[PDB]
């Protein structure tokens, strides 16, 4: 409890969960899953700007700094902003935005391979 990462209230501003199962992860994992599941997203949608991000579908490429830095650029620091963003203006959870993006992309849940769901927080 001294340094437990939930606060006293067990806040999970970055956690996301699937309502179809008990699977849950965070925003960085969601971004990684989105980059890995481009083929499914592109197939559902259906040299070119559309496929420009395909190279990032490789696990080894992402593990390499060449891909890790791209991952960290895409997934910035939602909990870090300007210094004036304090008190009543502290950052809020972007879990809603991430869930909306995932649902619109129709990315599949790793544990149940569903299509929708992916509510905010942790179930």
């Amino acid at each position: 409890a001294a340094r437990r990462v939930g606060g006293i209230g067990r806040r999970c501003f970055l956690t996301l969960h699937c309502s179809a199962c008990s699977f849950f992860f965070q925003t960085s994992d969601a971004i990684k899953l989105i980059l890995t599941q481009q083929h499914h997203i592109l197939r559902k949608k259906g040299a070119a700007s559309k496929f420009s991000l395909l190279p990032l579908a490789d696990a080894s490429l992402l593990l390499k700094r060449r891909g890790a830095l791209v991952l960290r650029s895409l997934h910035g620091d939602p909990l870090v902003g300007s210094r004036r963003q304090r008190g009543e203006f502290a950052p809020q959870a972007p879990t809603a935005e991430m869930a909306k993006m995932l649902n619109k992309s129709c990315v599949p849940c790793p544990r149940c391979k569903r299509e929708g769901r992916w509510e905010e927080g942790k179930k």
Binding site: A20, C112, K113, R114
Partner: protein, 498 residues
């Protein structure tokens, strides 16, 4: 404490969450009294709350519903909606359970069947011995099962038998269970039949009574070259004597014969003699006789006088009030079967000696007594029991109003005819019927779908004539004729039977 639990449960069902709905459904399943209106409300609530359940919870709800046979459009729609979620990454156990539940609940529809059939066909290899036997039984029970599915089941059974080859007992049991399941839907297969024949030849003596009966039934259904004939040279007399010595074994043998639809003259005569000898004991009358008589009547013994004597035994009538309502319903169903057989024999459809006026009067008196005793116990019965009672009352009224009954008996039979039992969805082939333009009508105790050299033995009841096959079972024929009469009463006349 001074409140009506059924009403409280009804209002909770109207306003309950998924967990509360599951608890209410379990309470209803385990409760004594069953309310068809409550079941309809539960089905509607399940359809409303379908999206809020998981695959396992949906399976549990389906099993709870199947506990008391019941289904409807709401349940069918919910199952169709959640079938894809159920079948995402399915297990062989889940596939078998879904197939069995669909067969039991009558959810015969292209949407509910085609994906399940495809998944079972693809994962045919994953199934083990017990799951494969369950699938074989379910497919045999089903209507117009796919030839590729049947062949896959046969190949899997043959391969598992080869892999396997106490041990002899298990091998014989698995082989002949699969063989009977496949023979219920006769078709052309070679390897499994050859393996079964070889096993019978090798271990004919090791066959227990139940396995021998299963082998005989499968051979008769499939018109095989010969399997029973090796089993004949096995001294089955000792096995039959052991089975008939004890009443419990006698009831087990009767149940097995009824399940296998086996009608052998010698076995039926020996079973009838055993039942008559055991009827002297009070225990057999109170426990086994009510169901043993029904099983015998369903097996249709050649001599109809013996069941009449057993039903009209004075001590049986004396002990009738102590019997449970289920036993009274079973006795009434046996009486209805006897009456139908007598009617067919007298009309010429069947062959043999019809009951004489003496036996007719005795049967009428027994039926009147049983109905009078059951009338104050009608609610203490399941939906299946109520449907069987309704069919029996329909037959009795067709015989009498169209054998005489008291005015109270006639009134009770009319009430049974006019009563609601909530018949479940029917079983029909998926491909043949164009379900997109069909409706359901409650006829007698069954739901009938309405669209807007084989010797054809005929049966008649109340003014109907059908070109039914040679081997039509008594209860099935009686139920079909009663359903046709109910349709005529409703207003539907064009009836097609295949």
């Amino acid at each position: 404490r001074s409140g009506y639990l059924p009403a409280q449960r009804f209002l909770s069902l109207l306003k309950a969450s998924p967990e509360e709905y599951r608890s209410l459904l379990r309470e209803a399943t385990q409760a004594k009294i069953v309310d068809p209106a409550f079941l309809r409300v539960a089905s509607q609530r399940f359809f409303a709350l379908s999206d809020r359940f998981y695959p396992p919870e949906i399976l549990d709800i389906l099993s709870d519903f199947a506990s008391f046979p019941y289904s409807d459009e709401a349940l069918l729609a919910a199952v169709a909606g959640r079938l894809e979620d159920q079948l995402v990454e399915p297990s062989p156990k889940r596939l078998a359970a879904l197939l069995s539940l669909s067969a039991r609940l009558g959810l015969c529809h292209p949407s509910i069947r085609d994906p399940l059939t495809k998944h079972i066909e693809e994962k045919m290899y994953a199934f083990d011995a017990a799951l494969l036997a369950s699938l074989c039984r379910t497919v045999g029970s089903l209507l117009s099962p796919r030839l590729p599915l049947l062949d896959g089941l046969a190949t899997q059974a043959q391969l598992l038998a080869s892999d396997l080859r106490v041990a002899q007992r298990r091998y014989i049991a698995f082989l002949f269970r699969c063989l009977e399941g496949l023979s219920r839907q006769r078709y052309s297969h070679s390897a499994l039949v050859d393996a079964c024949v070889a096993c019978a030849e090798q271990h004919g003596q090791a066959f227990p009574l139940h396995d021998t009966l299963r082998a005989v039934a499968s051979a008769r259904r499939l018109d095989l070259a010969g399997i029973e004939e090796p089993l004949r040279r096995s001294d089955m007399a000792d096995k039959v004597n052991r089975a008939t010595d004890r009443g419990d074994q006698l009831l087990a043998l009767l149940r097995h014969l009824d399940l296998l639809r086996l009608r052998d003259s010698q076995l039926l005569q020996k079973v009838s003699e055993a039942v008559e000898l055991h009827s002297q004991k009070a225990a057999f009358l109170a426990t086994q006789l009510p169901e043993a008589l029904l099983h015998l009547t369903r097996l249709a013994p050649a001599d109809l006088r013996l069941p009449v004597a057993l039903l009209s035994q004075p001590s049986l009538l004396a002990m009738a009030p102590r019997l449970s309502a289920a036993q009274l319903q079973q006795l009434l169903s046996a009486s209805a079967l006897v009456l139908f057989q007598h009617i067919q024999r007298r009309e010429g459809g069947q062959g043999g000696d019809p009951l004489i006026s003496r036996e007719a009067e005795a049967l009428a008196k027994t039926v009147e007594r049983f109905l009078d005793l059951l009338q104050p116990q009608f609610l203490s019965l399941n939906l299946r029991d109520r449907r069987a009672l309704k069919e029996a009352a329909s037959l009795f009224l067709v015989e009498a109003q169209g054998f005489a009954l008291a005015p109270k008996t006639v009134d009770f039979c009319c009430f049974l005819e006019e009563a609601d039992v909530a018949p479940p969805l029917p079983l029909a082939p998926s491909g043949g019927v164009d379900f997109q333009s069909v409706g359901l009508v409650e006829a007698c105790s069954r739901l009938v779908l309405c669209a807007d050299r084989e010797e054809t033995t005929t049966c008649k009841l109340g003014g109907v004539s059908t070109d039914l096959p040679v081997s039509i079972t008594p209860q099935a024929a009686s139920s079909l004729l009663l359903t046709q009469l109910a349709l005529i009463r409703r207003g539907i006349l064009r009836h097609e039977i295949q």
